[PDB]
Amino acid sequence: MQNTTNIVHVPVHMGHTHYFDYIDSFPKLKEGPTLEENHITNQKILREQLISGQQGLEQNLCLRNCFKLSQKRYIEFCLDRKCGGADFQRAATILGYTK
């Protein structure tokens, strides 16, 4: 079995140039926004989050940290002990984990 064998699941286009073998292009490649455009787009999100998304944050952060535990029984213990007697299903709806 050839040692330099690879199975690729996305299309690649190989350049037919003498003395070189490489991938010169990807079919249907779309050039997205520049790094500066995404930078400006992100700053608008961070600016709003800095001005209007900082009240009532301490509670939401505690809920998020409680849900990062391994077992469910430890989450309920974290909510009741740290988050001031919160409910599992009621906190999961705030964090957006409910369907």
Partner 1 sequence: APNPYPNGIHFDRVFPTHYDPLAETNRTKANLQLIKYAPGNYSTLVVTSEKLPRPCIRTIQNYRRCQM
Partner 2 sequence: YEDFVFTTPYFQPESTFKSVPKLFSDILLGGVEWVYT
Partner 3 sequence: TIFAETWEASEYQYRNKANLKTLPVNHLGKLAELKFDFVEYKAHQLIACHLYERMTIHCMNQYGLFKDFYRPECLDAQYYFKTCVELNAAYGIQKKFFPEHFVGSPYARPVPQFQQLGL
The binding site for partner 1 (CB under 8 A) comprises 67, 72, 97, 99
Q: Taking the complex as a whole, how short is the minimal distance between the CB of residue 9 and partner 1, in angstroms? A: 15
Rounded to whole angstroms, how far apart are CA atoms 74 and 95?
Answer: 18
Q: Looking at 73, 84, 85, 96, which residue binds partner 2 (CB under 8 A)?
A: 73
Query: Which two three-digit tokens encode residue 8?
Result: 């690729």
Q: Which one of partner 1, partner 2, partner 3, none interacts with residue 99, CB within 5 to 8 A by kind?
A: partner 1
Rounded to whole angstroms, how far apart are CA atoms 61 and 91?
Answer: 11
What does each C-alpha distance from 5 to 1, 8, 18, 27 come to in angstroms? Answer: 8, 10, 21, 21
Binders in 3-62 for partner 3, by CB under 8 A: 7
Q: Binding residues for partner 3, per CB under 8 A?
A: 1-2, 7
